[PDB]
Amino acid sequence: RMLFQTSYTLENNGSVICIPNNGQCFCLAWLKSNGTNAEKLAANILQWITFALSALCLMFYGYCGWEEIYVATIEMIKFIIEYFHEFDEPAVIYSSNGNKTVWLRYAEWLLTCPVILIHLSNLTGLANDYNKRTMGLLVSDIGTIVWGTTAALSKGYVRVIFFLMGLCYGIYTFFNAAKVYIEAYHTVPKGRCRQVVTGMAWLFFVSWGMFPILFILGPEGFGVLSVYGSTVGHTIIDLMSKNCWGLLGHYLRVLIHEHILIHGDIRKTTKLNITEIEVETLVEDEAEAGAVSSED
Amino acid sequence: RMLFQTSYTLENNGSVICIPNNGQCFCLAWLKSNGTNAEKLAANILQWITFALSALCLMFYGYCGWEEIYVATIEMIKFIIEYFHEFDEPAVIYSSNGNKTVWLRYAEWLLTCPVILIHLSNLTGLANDYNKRTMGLLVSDIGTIVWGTTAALSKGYVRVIFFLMGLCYGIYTFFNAAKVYIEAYHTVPKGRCRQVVTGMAWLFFVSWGMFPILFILGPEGFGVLSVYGSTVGHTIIDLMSKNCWGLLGHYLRVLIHEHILIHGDIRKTTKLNITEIEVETLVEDEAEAGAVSSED
Ligand SMILES: *[C@@H]1O[C@H](CO)[C@@H](O[C@@H]2O[C@H](CO)[C@@H](O)[C@H](O)[C@H]2NC(C)=O)[C@H](O)[C@H]1NC(C)=O
Ligand SMILES: *[C@@H]1O[C@H](CO)[C@@H](O[C@@H]2O[C@H](CO)[C@@H](O)[C@H](O)[C@H]2NC(C)=O)[C@H](O)[C@H]1NC(C)=O
Ligand SMILES: CCCCCCCC/C=C/CCCCCCCC(=O)OC[C@H](O)CO
Ligand SMILES: CCCCCCCC/C=C/CCCCCCCC(=O)OC[C@H](O)CO
Ligand SMILES: *C\C=C(C)/C=C/C=C(C)/C=C/C1=C(C)CCCC1(C)C
Ligand SMILES: *C\C=C(C)/C=C/C=C(C)/C=C/C1=C(C)CCCC1(C)C
C-alpha cells in the first residue's frame, strides 16, 4: 500500500539489488517497520479520542474566541488525513538519505504557532493591543520549528547543528512566555481566574517542553522510539497542547468577560519587579483602583 | 557528488535496474539534470550579487531596526549553505514520489515572515503597539507557506488542493497588507516619507505576487522552469523581497525619527473611509493638529 517500490530480488549473493524499471523510487531504509501492532493499536485509539475531543471542543465553542476554534479546526483536518493517508507522502516524507520525516506534524505546528502565541498574548481577551514581546515570541518560535524541521530532514553533524539552533531560539521563546504568564496572573481577578491561568502555565511548559524530548527520542534523533511509538507520544502531548489548553483558555476568557458584565473593568497598577514591570489588576471592588508596587 | 546512488546497470533489455547493495537510496527521478550550464552560470552570479548586497546592507545598518538586519542575516547564512551544499539534502529534499523540494527556500520564508510582517505593522518605527490586523496577517501568511510546502512535497490532485488552500490564505494576507500600507501612507509626513511608503508598497505586492507565479512555473508545478531557471528567478525577486525592501524600510524609519528630532511628534486625526477608519497624521506644522475626515 506504499507508492514506492516495495518488491525486489537480491542478486550476486545479496551484493546487487534488482528492481523493476517501473519508474518507482527505491530505498531499503524506507521499508524498516513502523513498529509493533500493539504500538499501532494504541496509536489508532488515542487518534480517535483526539478526533472526539477536537469535535466536542468545536461544537462547545459554537454556543473573540477565534484562536481556540482554529486549533481544534486544524486538529480535525489533521485526523481526516491521518485516517486515510497517515504514512503516504507527503504526510510522511521518505527522502534520499533514507529519513522518514512526519511533515504532517511540523505543518500543523507552523500553522497554529501564531494562533497559540497570539492567544498567549491575549489570555483575558480584553486587550486590542499586543506589546513588542508578542512579536519576539512569534519570530523565535517559527525559527525553532524551521531549524527543527531542517534537523529532522538532515543527518549526522548537520542534524546536530540545526537542533542546537532550534534549542537557542526555543530558550528565547520559553523565557519570554514565562514573563507573559507572570503578567497574566497579576492582571486577572484574585479568585478562580488565577487558578485557571496557573493551570494553563503548567499545561503550556510541560506540553511544549516534551516536544524537543520526543524529537531526541524519535526516528529524527536516536531512534529510541519507533514510528507508532512516536505517534502515541505525540497524541498524548497533542491532547494537552491543543484541545485542553484552548478549552482552559476559553474558560478563562468566559470568566474574565463575565467579570466585566457584573463588576465592570476595574483596573489597578500592580508595579512588579520580578526589573520594574507594571500590570493592570482587574478587581471586584470599585474602591481598589490604585498603584500597588509589589516588588518580587 | 550526490549522496544517493547515481551508478546503475540496465538488465533484461532495460526492464530491470540493478544497483549495488551499498544501502544508498535510488530513484531515476532524482537524476534528471538541474538545467543548462548557462542557467547555472547566471544563477551563481546573481547569488554572489545577493551575498554582496546582503553584506553591504548589514554593515550599513551597523552605523529599533531589528527586522531589517535579521532578514539580511538569514540571507547571508542562506548563501554560505548554497555555496557549499545547494543541491545536498536537506537544502533540496529528494523524496519517495520522485519530487525535488527546495526546503532551503521555504525554511528562510517561514523564519523571516514574522520579521517582515512585524516590520509591515511598524513602518514608522514609532508604534509600541500592534493592532488585531497584524495578528491575522501572521496567521494567514504562515498557513500560506505551510500549505504551499505541503503542495511542493505532494503530486496530482493532492498538490492541487494544498496550492488552492495556500491561495485562499494568501488572498487574506494580500487584502489586509493593502489596508496597512493605506494607513502607513496617511500616517507619515506629507513629503519624502510618502514617496518611500509608496515605493515599499510597489516592491511588496510585485515581489510577493511573483512567488505563487514561480511556484506554478517551477518543478513544484508544471515544470516549465528547470531547477537553475527557478534559482535565477528566485535570486531576482529575493533581492527585491528582502535586501531592497528592508533598505527602503530603514530609510523610511530614519526619515520618520529625524522628523521627531526636528518638528516633534505632531499627530492629526485623518478619518479615512476607504469603512470609517482613523489615522494619526504626523505633520511638520504645530498649528495642524485636528480631525481631517478625508472619506475615500
Ligand atoms: C555470501 O554471503 C554470505 C552471507 O550470509 C556469506 O556467509 C557468511 O560469511 C561471512 C564471511 O564474510 C561470515 O562472517 C558468516 O558467518 C557466514 N555465514 C552466515 C550464515 O552469515 C558467504 O561467505 C558469501 N559467499 C561468497 C562466495 O562470497
Ligand atoms: C527491447 O527494447 C527495445 C527498446 O529500444 C525494443 O526496441 C524497439 O521496440 C519497440 C516495440 O515495442 C518499437 O516501438 C521501437 O521502435 C523499437 N526500436 C527502438 C530503437 O526503440 C525491443 O523490441 C525490445 N526487445 C525485446 C526482445 O523485447
Ligand atoms: C526551555 C525548554 C526545555 C526543554 C529543552 C530541551 C533540552 C534538550 C537538549 C538536549 C541536548 C542533547 C543533544 C541533542 C542534539 C540533537 C542532535 C543529535 O541527536 O545528533 C545526532 C548525532 O550527531 C549522530 O548520530
Ligand atoms: C493576491 C496575490 C496575487 C497572486 C495570486 C496568484 C494566482 C495563481 C492562481 C493560479 C491558478 C491555476 C492553478 C494552480 C494550482 C496548482 C496545482 C497544479 O499545478 O496541479 C497539478 C495537476 O493537477 C497535475 O499535473
Ligand atoms: C500543535 C501544537 C504545538 C503546541 C506544537 C509545538 C511544538 C514545539 C514546541 C516544538 C519544539 C521544538 C523545539 C523546542 C526544539 C527542537 C525542534 C522542535 C520544533 C521539536
Ligand atoms: C524571503 C522573503 C519572502 C518575502 C518570501 C515570500 C514567499 C511567499 C510570498 C510565498 C507565497 C506563496 C503563495 C502566495 C501561494 C503558493 C505557495 C507560496 C508559499 C509559494
Side-chain angles (χ1 to χ4, degrees), chain A residues 30-44:
Chain A
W30 300 335
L31 306 169
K32 289 191 218 178
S33 66
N34 294 323
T36 82
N37 289 306
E39 284 185 323
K40 181 205 281 172
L41 180 78
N44 300 126

PDB file of all heavy atoms in Angstrom, chain A residues 30-44:
ATOM      1  N   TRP A  30      13.524   2.961   3.730  1.00  0.00           N
ATOM      2  CA  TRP A  30      12.082   3.313   3.775  1.00  0.00           C
ATOM      3  C   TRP A  30      11.257   2.125   4.279  1.00  0.00           C
ATOM      4  O   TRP A  30      10.138   2.389   4.809  1.00  0.00           O
ATOM      5  CB  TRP A  30      11.580   3.797   2.411  1.00  0.00           C
ATOM      6  CG  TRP A  30      12.268   5.014   1.879  1.00  0.00           C
ATOM      7  CD1 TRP A  30      12.908   5.970   2.614  1.00  0.00           C
ATOM      8  CD2 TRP A  30      12.382   5.413   0.497  1.00  0.00           C
ATOM      9  NE1 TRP A  30      13.449   6.916   1.788  1.00  0.00           N
ATOM     10  CE2 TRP A  30      13.137   6.607   0.483  1.00  0.00           C
ATOM     11  CE3 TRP A  30      11.946   4.864  -0.718  1.00  0.00           C
ATOM     12  CZ2 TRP A  30      13.444   7.270  -0.711  1.00  0.00           C
ATOM     13  CZ3 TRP A  30      12.256   5.503  -1.898  1.00  0.00           C
ATOM     14  CH2 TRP A  30      12.995   6.693  -1.886  1.00  0.00           C
ATOM     15  N   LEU A  31      11.745   0.889   4.106  1.00  0.00           N
ATOM     16  CA  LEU A  31      10.919  -0.339   4.287  1.00  0.00           C
ATOM     17  C   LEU A  31      10.996  -0.825   5.729  1.00  0.00           C
ATOM     18  O   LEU A  31      10.147  -1.691   6.048  1.00  0.00           O
ATOM     19  CB  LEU A  31      11.348  -1.438   3.304  1.00  0.00           C
ATOM     20  CG  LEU A  31      11.378  -1.034   1.831  1.00  0.00           C
ATOM     21  CD1 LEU A  31      12.054  -2.110   1.032  1.00  0.00           C
ATOM     22  CD2 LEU A  31       9.994  -0.759   1.269  1.00  0.00           C
ATOM     23  N   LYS A  32      11.897  -0.256   6.556  1.00  0.00           N
ATOM     24  CA  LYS A  32      12.005  -0.590   8.006  1.00  0.00           C
ATOM     25  C   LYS A  32      10.615  -0.479   8.627  1.00  0.00           C
ATOM     26  O   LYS A  32       9.949   0.488   8.304  1.00  0.00           O
ATOM     27  CB  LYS A  32      12.946   0.374   8.732  1.00  0.00           C
ATOM     28  CG  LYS A  32      14.428   0.221   8.406  1.00  0.00           C
ATOM     29  CD  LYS A  32      15.328   1.011   9.332  1.00  0.00           C
ATOM     30  CE  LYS A  32      16.503   1.618   8.595  1.00  0.00           C
ATOM     31  NZ  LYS A  32      17.374   2.428   9.486  1.00  0.00           N
ATOM     32  N   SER A  33      10.192  -1.435   9.453  1.00  0.00           N
ATOM     33  CA  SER A  33       8.812  -1.474  10.007  1.00  0.00           C
ATOM     34  C   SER A  33       8.594  -0.212  10.838  1.00  0.00           C
ATOM     35  O   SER A  33       9.584   0.321  11.365  1.00  0.00           O
ATOM     36  CB  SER A  33       8.563  -2.713  10.830  1.00  0.00           C
ATOM     37  OG  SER A  33       9.366  -2.712  12.010  1.00  0.00           O
ATOM     38  N   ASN A  34       7.341   0.241  10.935  1.00  0.00           N
ATOM     39  CA  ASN A  34       6.920   1.455  11.692  1.00  0.00           C
ATOM     40  C   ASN A  34       6.655   1.092  13.162  1.00  0.00           C
ATOM     41  O   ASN A  34       6.457   2.027  13.970  1.00  0.00           O
ATOM     42  CB  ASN A  34       5.739   2.129  10.985  1.00  0.00           C
ATOM     43  CG  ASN A  34       6.150   2.680   9.627  1.00  0.00           C
ATOM     44  OD1 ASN A  34       7.261   3.182   9.485  1.00  0.00           O
ATOM     45  ND2 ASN A  34       5.293   2.555   8.617  1.00  0.00           N
ATOM     46  N   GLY A  35       6.689  -0.204  13.500  1.00  0.00           N
ATOM     47  CA  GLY A  35       6.613  -0.709  14.886  1.00  0.00           C
ATOM     48  C   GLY A  35       5.675  -1.907  15.025  1.00  0.00           C
ATOM     49  O   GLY A  35       5.184  -2.410  13.998  1.00  0.00           O
ATOM     50  N   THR A  36       5.406  -2.333  16.259  1.00  0.00           N
ATOM     51  CA  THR A  36       4.546  -3.494  16.615  1.00  0.00           C
ATOM     52  C   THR A  36       3.061  -3.156  16.374  1.00  0.00           C
ATOM     53  O   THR A  36       2.710  -1.973  16.311  1.00  0.00           O
ATOM     54  CB  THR A  36       4.783  -3.933  18.071  1.00  0.00           C
ATOM     55  OG1 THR A  36       4.003  -3.082  18.919  1.00  0.00           O
ATOM     56  CG2 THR A  36       6.242  -3.894  18.487  1.00  0.00           C
ATOM     57  N   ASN A  37       2.206  -4.171  16.263  1.00  0.00           N
ATOM     58  CA  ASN A  37       0.748  -3.992  16.031  1.00  0.00           C
ATOM     59  C   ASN A  37       0.106  -3.440  17.310  1.00  0.00           C
ATOM     60  O   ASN A  37      -0.917  -2.729  17.198  1.00  0.00           O
ATOM     61  CB  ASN A  37       0.078  -5.283  15.562  1.00  0.00           C
ATOM     62  CG  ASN A  37       0.466  -5.653  14.144  1.00  0.00           C
ATOM     63  OD1 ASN A  37       0.330  -4.861  13.200  1.00  0.00           O
ATOM     64  ND2 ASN A  37       0.927  -6.881  13.966  1.00  0.00           N
ATOM     65  N   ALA A  38       0.696  -3.732  18.476  1.00  0.00           N
ATOM     66  CA  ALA A  38       0.273  -3.210  19.800  1.00  0.00           C
ATOM     67  C   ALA A  38       0.483  -1.691  19.835  1.00  0.00           C
ATOM     68  O   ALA A  38      -0.449  -0.966  20.274  1.00  0.00           O
ATOM     69  CB  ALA A  38       1.041  -3.892  20.907  1.00  0.00           C
ATOM     70  N   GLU A  39       1.665  -1.241  19.396  1.00  0.00           N
ATOM     71  CA  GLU A  39       2.005   0.201  19.261  1.00  0.00           C
ATOM     72  C   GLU A  39       0.987   0.854  18.318  1.00  0.00           C
ATOM     73  O   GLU A  39       0.441   1.935  18.663  1.00  0.00           O
ATOM     74  CB  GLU A  39       3.438   0.385  18.756  1.00  0.00           C
ATOM     75  CG  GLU A  39       4.514   0.151  19.811  1.00  0.00           C
ATOM     76  CD  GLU A  39       5.935   0.442  19.353  1.00  0.00           C
ATOM     77  OE1 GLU A  39       6.259   0.150  18.180  1.00  0.00           O
ATOM     78  OE2 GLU A  39       6.723   0.977  20.171  1.00  0.00           O
ATOM     79  N   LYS A  40       0.741   0.224  17.170  1.00  0.00           N
ATOM     80  CA  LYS A  40      -0.189   0.743  16.138  1.00  0.00           C
ATOM     81  C   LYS A  40      -1.605   0.833  16.725  1.00  0.00           C
ATOM     82  O   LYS A  40      -2.248   1.885  16.523  1.00  0.00           O
ATOM     83  CB  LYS A  40      -0.169  -0.145  14.892  1.00  0.00           C
ATOM     84  CG  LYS A  40      -1.065   0.307  13.747  1.00  0.00           C
ATOM     85  CD  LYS A  40      -1.489  -0.832  12.845  1.00  0.00           C
ATOM     86  CE  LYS A  40      -0.413  -1.250  11.865  1.00  0.00           C
ATOM     87  NZ  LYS A  40      -0.762  -2.484  11.113  1.00  0.00           N
ATOM     88  N   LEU A  41      -2.073  -0.216  17.420  1.00  0.00           N
ATOM     89  CA  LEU A  41      -3.445  -0.272  18.006  1.00  0.00           C
ATOM     90  C   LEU A  41      -3.611   0.893  18.991  1.00  0.00           C
ATOM     91  O   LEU A  41      -4.623   1.619  18.898  1.00  0.00           O
ATOM     92  CB  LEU A  41      -3.687  -1.622  18.699  1.00  0.00           C
ATOM     93  CG  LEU A  41      -5.075  -1.792  19.331  1.00  0.00           C
ATOM     94  CD1 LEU A  41      -6.130  -2.099  18.276  1.00  0.00           C
ATOM     95  CD2 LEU A  41      -5.074  -2.870  20.410  1.00  0.00           C
ATOM     96  N   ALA A  42      -2.638   1.065  19.891  1.00  0.00           N
ATOM     97  CA  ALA A  42      -2.609   2.140  20.912  1.00  0.00           C
ATOM     98  C   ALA A  42      -2.734   3.495  20.207  1.00  0.00           C
ATOM     99  O   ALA A  42      -3.505   4.351  20.687  1.00  0.00           O
ATOM    100  CB  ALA A  42      -1.344   2.042  21.738  1.00  0.00           C
ATOM    101  N   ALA A  43      -2.021   3.655  19.087  1.00  0.00           N
ATOM    102  CA  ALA A  43      -1.946   4.913  18.309  1.00  0.00           C
ATOM    103  C   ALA A  43      -3.306   5.210  17.669  1.00  0.00           C
ATOM    104  O   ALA A  43      -3.712   6.385  17.708  1.00  0.00           O
ATOM    105  CB  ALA A  43      -0.847   4.838  17.278  1.00  0.00           C
ATOM    106  N   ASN A  44      -3.979   4.200  17.116  1.00  0.00           N
ATOM    107  CA  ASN A  44      -5.303   4.353  16.447  1.00  0.00           C
ATOM    108  C   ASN A  44      -6.388   4.742  17.465  1.00  0.00           C
ATOM    109  O   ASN A  44      -7.266   5.555  17.078  1.00  0.00           O
ATOM    110  CB  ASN A  44      -5.702   3.097  15.670  1.00  0.00           C
ATOM    111  CG  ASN A  44      -4.696   2.758  14.594  1.00  0.00           C
ATOM    112  OD1 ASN A  44      -4.186   1.640  14.537  1.00  0.00           O
ATOM    113  ND2 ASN A  44      -4.379   3.730  13.756  1.00  0.00           N
TER     114      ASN A  44
END
